[PDB]
Amino acid sequence: MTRLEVLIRPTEQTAAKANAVGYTHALTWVWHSQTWDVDSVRDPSLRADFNPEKVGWVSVSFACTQCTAHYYTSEQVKYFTNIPPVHFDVVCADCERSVQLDDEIDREHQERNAEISACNARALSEGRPASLVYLSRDACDIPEHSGRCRFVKYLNF
Ligand SMILES: [Zn+2]
Ligand SMILES: [Zn+2]
Numbered sequence: 001m002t003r004l005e006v007l008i009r010p011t012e013q014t015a016a017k018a019n020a021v022g023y024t025h026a027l028t029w030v031w032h033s034q035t036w037d038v039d040s041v042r043d044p045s046l047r048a049d050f051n052p053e054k055v056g057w058v059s060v061s062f063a064c065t066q067c068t069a070h071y072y073t074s075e076q077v078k079y080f081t082n083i084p085p086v087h088f089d090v091v092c093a094d095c096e097r098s099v100q101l102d103d104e105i106d107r108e109h110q111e112r113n114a115e116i117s118a119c120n121a122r123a124l125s126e127g128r129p130a131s132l133v134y135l136s137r138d139a140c141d142i143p144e145h146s147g148r149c150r151f152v153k154y155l156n157f
Helices: 015-021 095-100 102-126
Strands: 002-010 026-032 045-064 070-081 086-090
Touching (some): 002 015, 002 070, 015 045, 026 070
Parallel strands (some): 045 086
Antiparallel strands (some): 002 026, 045 070
């Protein structure tokens, strides 16, 4: 449960009338779940048309660029109209983790390939063929990588 505050202030074309009645801004808010607790979701600041006789909607849409997670909320704002739609097209909290695995996959390939190196060397000292090959994403024998890498179970065995 996270509050997202939205500040609305008059456009240039309505600012004089807003001043005349002394109503210079609206501060409103909506709420969102943990899915959208990410750095790129920040309290917006908007310009809209002050109008003394209308109530407008502010709409805030969230959508993940990597998955189809999405969320729509809205709130009424007195005396402001034509409020720009707010869109957060972001990488959601669950997808943030998935793209970061690249640093893990790479580290684990480095480790494995060190062990492959050692096995090949040992084999050359025992008079067996040194048949193992280093891993990459296109040819990987770590079972937990399957999908992120092309799992080739018997690559090195
Ligand atoms: Zn996502
Ligand atoms: Zn791999």
